[PDB]
């Protein structure tokens, strides 16, 4: 914050072992694909300051979403299709099915 780039210099110690403990991180929803260590400089109206960046690339898991919100849609659309086998004489059954599937 206070010291510009002619007063302080940031660097990672080891340049690849500076950040540890990533492979042990378990997230309930995501999964750490990899992580990057970047060294650069930013320029503001008051000076040029050093900067490091530790960047994670999380990828979201899909099992919960399939089992939770994709399957119900497919089953409701199939429950809508079943109405094609019902004869056209029953107007309270095919209407029932279709309307209910819409609501759902």
């Amino acid at each position: 914050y206070g010291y510009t780039t002619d007063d302080i210099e940031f660097y990672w110690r080891g340049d690849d072992n500076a950040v540890t403990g990533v492979t042990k991180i378990e997230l309930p929803q995501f999964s750490i694909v990899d992580y990057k260590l970047i060294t650069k400089k930013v320029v503001f109206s008051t000076g040029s300051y050093p900067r490091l960046s530790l960047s994670f690339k999380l990828k979201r898991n899909i099992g919960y979403f399939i089992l939770q919100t994709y399957m119900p849609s497919i089953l409701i659309t199939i429950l809508s299709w079943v109405s094609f086998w019902i004869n056209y004489d029953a107007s309270a059954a095919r209407v029932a099915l279709g309307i209910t599937t819409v609501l759902t």
Binding site: T20, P28, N61, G63, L79, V82, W85, A92, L97, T100
Partner: protein
């Protein structure tokens, strides 16, 4: 009187930045605890609250006096003037001492330099619960602490024989779980700074089956038998059996959305969502079976006649079998 003189002589030429025996040998610290209450174990955040009375005793040859009084008993007014080990809990999301009305601390300096330092803590410790076998799951998840800046060569912790002593275990907020025991452990870990002596206390929790047994299992099995009730309604009334099926499916998906909303978002299959999935399958199979029944009545009536009565026997037997298998397996597993 003269205790003021003793306290003034102990702090004359005293540097509270240097551990006792800074360049001789590591400082042996004996740690004891007193678990007041183990707070609610919420699985959504993989955390649990605990409230303890952490006591640390070590030897300090600089706080060694020679007078008639054997022990000096002091409040928290002299804790910030002597050396105090920097014990921190390595798996605590958020923890804090107590300050009402006066900082909850105690300092007792014996005659030969032995210091006892006790404080009250409320730690939101972390433990990643493996939410399989839910709700027939058992956990044993720890509370780890160690020095922060002093490696194994400087500060060595060591449990006492009777170190950890739980309270009454009855007025605790362990609702869904049940305390069965604990065990202490000492190891040495490697860090970017050095080798540290890490102590651990493992608390064993066993999930009692009651809240989930009455919140999801009974509702879903009674919904299943409600779906079976359609097998006795006459096959000509179509909109009635179709309403049975579709409303049963709606309630089934709502109940699954709730049981799953109980525990956090996990990408694997637990033992409860498996149950609600089997029940969903049962309802969907009763519906599609009556579907093919009504459709086949137009094609072949005797098929449907033998099919209603076939299903009336085939469904409850398959459900009893499923239940038996599931329950027995998990109770043995």
């Amino acid at each position: 009187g003269d205790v003021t003189v003793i306290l003034n002589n102990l702090l004359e030429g005293y540097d509270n930045k240097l551990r006792p025996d800074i360049g001789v040998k590591p400082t042996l610290i004996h740690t004891d605890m007193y678990v007041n209450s183990i707070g609610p174990v919420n699985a959504i955040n993989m955390e649990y609250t605990i409230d303890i009375f952490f006591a640390q005793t070590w030897y300090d040859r600089r706080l060694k006096f020679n007078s008639t009084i054997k022990v000096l008993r002091l409040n928290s007014n002299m804790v910030g003037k002597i050396w105090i080990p920097d014990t921190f809990f390595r798996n605590s999301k958020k923890a804090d001492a107590h300050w009402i009305t006066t900082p909850n601390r105690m300092l007792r300096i014996w005659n030969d330099g032995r210091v006892l330092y006790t404080l009250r803590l409320t730690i939101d410790a972390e433990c990643q619960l493996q939410l399989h076998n839910f709700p027939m799951d058992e956990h044993s998840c720890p509370l780890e602490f160690s020095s922060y800046g002093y490696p194994r060569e400087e500060i060595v912790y060591q449990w006492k024989r009777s170190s950890v002593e739980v309270g009454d275990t009855r007025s605790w907020r362990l609702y869904q779980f049940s305390f069965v025991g604990l065990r202490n452990t000492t190891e040495v870990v490697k860090t970017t700074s050095g080798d540290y002596v890490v102590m651990s206390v493992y608390f064993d929790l066993s999930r009692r089956m009651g809240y989930f047994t009455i919140q999801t299992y009974i509702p879903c099995t009674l919904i299943v038998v409600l779906s079976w009730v359609s097998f006795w309604i006459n096959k000509d009334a179509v909109p009635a059996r179709t309403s049975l099926g579709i409303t049963t499916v709606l309630t089934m998906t709502t109940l699954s959305t709730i049981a799953r909303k109980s525990l956090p978002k996990v990408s694997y299959v637990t033992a409860m969502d498996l149950f609600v999935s089997v029940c969903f399958i049962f309802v969907f199979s009763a519906l599609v079976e009556y579907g093919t029944l009504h459709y086949f009545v137009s094609s072949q009536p005797a098929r449907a006649a033998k099919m209603d009565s076939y299903a009336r026997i085939f469904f409850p037997t398959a459900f009893c079998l499923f239940n038996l298998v599931y329950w027995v397996s998990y109770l043995y597993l």
